[PDB]
């Protein structure tokens, strides 16, 4: 099932207060008028770049991880005894999580206890950036079960955990004992222009890439655009494929022998060879790894295999370590 997202999923992007101002920001937001998957047993969901969650006290806690098999650390949020518990232990998980899930609690590297949260929907946003797992949420009244409310409401932040675990998949948790329902959307690095009112709450927002009118609203840093002609961006057709054209030359470069030469000249009489008109496979040179010092100046060492030079002079000698 799919639902429409409309103008929900906006969160305070920088936690610094602003007032009566239109602020343009680049961050992970849920693009407007996008389709969000509606689930109504629980599936395994991809996490990608962040998740928007909505639900309408049946649904408690969430599970995040990469493999979900006690081989890697997995974020667990549970609402028990009115004190919410967050842990990152290598629990061994069940096929369908519902207390069993918290067994084999070893290699624990983070534990946190916080105060409890959760006709009203409960919106959450989970974002994992540079090791910080940021969780935002708000509760709001509803009297329409057929869809997701139309309107605008900014999601107040709750906490930010320095877990730093590579998260790829997540799952919701049901109360252990025809079911409940939730909506999940996926966040994208879109640019948003947010209106801060006198009190400091976001009352409106415009997606800078959703529509040409929204592009003007973003470029003009205004929510009303008077009649006229406006330029917002630039059309440039992107390349379709890469093509490489090189001479038919198949000669191999002397490099092989030069490194492997048995008798080397003395440092005072360093040997110089001029090398041109030959293909040179630096990947064999690299994967022949027995070197103790490899430092290149004025070129990147990792990208010597993608250029073309007029000629290479090879000097060689033997010296002491220091």
């Amino acid at each position: 099932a799919y639902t429409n997202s409309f103008t929900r999923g906006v969160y305070y992007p920088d936690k610094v207060f602003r007032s009566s101002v239109l602020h343009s920001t680049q961050d992970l937001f849920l693009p407007f008028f996008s389709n969000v998957t509606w689930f109504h047993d629980n599936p395994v969901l991809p996490f990608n770049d962040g998740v928007y969650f909505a639900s309408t006290n049946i649904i408690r806690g969430w599970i995040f991880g990469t493999t979900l098999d006690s081989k890697t650390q997995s974020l667990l949020i549970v609402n028990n005894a009115t004190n919410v518990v967050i842990k990152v232990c290598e629990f061994q998980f069940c096929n369908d999580p519902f207390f069993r899930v918290y067994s084999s609690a070893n290699n624990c590297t983070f534990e946190y206890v916080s105060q409890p949260f959760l006709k009203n929907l409960r919106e959450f946003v989970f974002k994992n950036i540079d090791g910080y797992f940021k969780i935002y949420s708000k509760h709001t009244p509803i009297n329409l079960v057929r869809d997701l409310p139309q309107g605008f409401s900014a999601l107040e932040p709750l906490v930010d955990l320095p877990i730093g675990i590579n998260i790829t998949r997540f799952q919701t948790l049901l109360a252990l004992h025809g079911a409940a329902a939730y909506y999940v959307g996926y966040l994208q690095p879109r640019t948003f222009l947010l209106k801060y009112n006198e009190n400091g709450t976001i009352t409106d927002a415009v997606d800078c890439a959703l529509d040409p009118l929204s592009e003007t609203k973003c470029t003009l840093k205004s929510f009303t655009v008077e009649k006229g002609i406006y330029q917002t961006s630039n059309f440039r057709v992107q390349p379709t494929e890469s093509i490489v054209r090189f001479p038919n030359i198949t000669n191999l470069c002397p490099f092989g022998e030069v490194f492997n030469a048995t008798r080397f000249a003395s440092v005072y009489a360093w040997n110089r060879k001029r090398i041109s008109n030959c293909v040179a496979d630096y990947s064999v040179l690299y994967n022949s790894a027995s070197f103790s010092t490899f430092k290149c100046y004025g070129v990147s060492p990792t990208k010597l295999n993608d250029l073309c030079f007029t000629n290479v002079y090879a000097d060689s000698f033997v010296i002491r370590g220091d």
Binding site: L213, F223, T224, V225, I229, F235, V237
Partner: peptide, 29 residues
């Protein structure tokens, strides 16, 4: 924005085959 939310897009100096469509000497509207 006070009259209508309808918009038209003009691609300047870009004869349009690349993605009503009216070709003008200023571009593709």
């Amino acid at each position: 924005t006070n009259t209508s939310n309808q918009v038209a897009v003009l691609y300047q100096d870009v004869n349009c085959t690349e993605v009503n469509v009216f070709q003008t000497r200023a571009g593709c509207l």
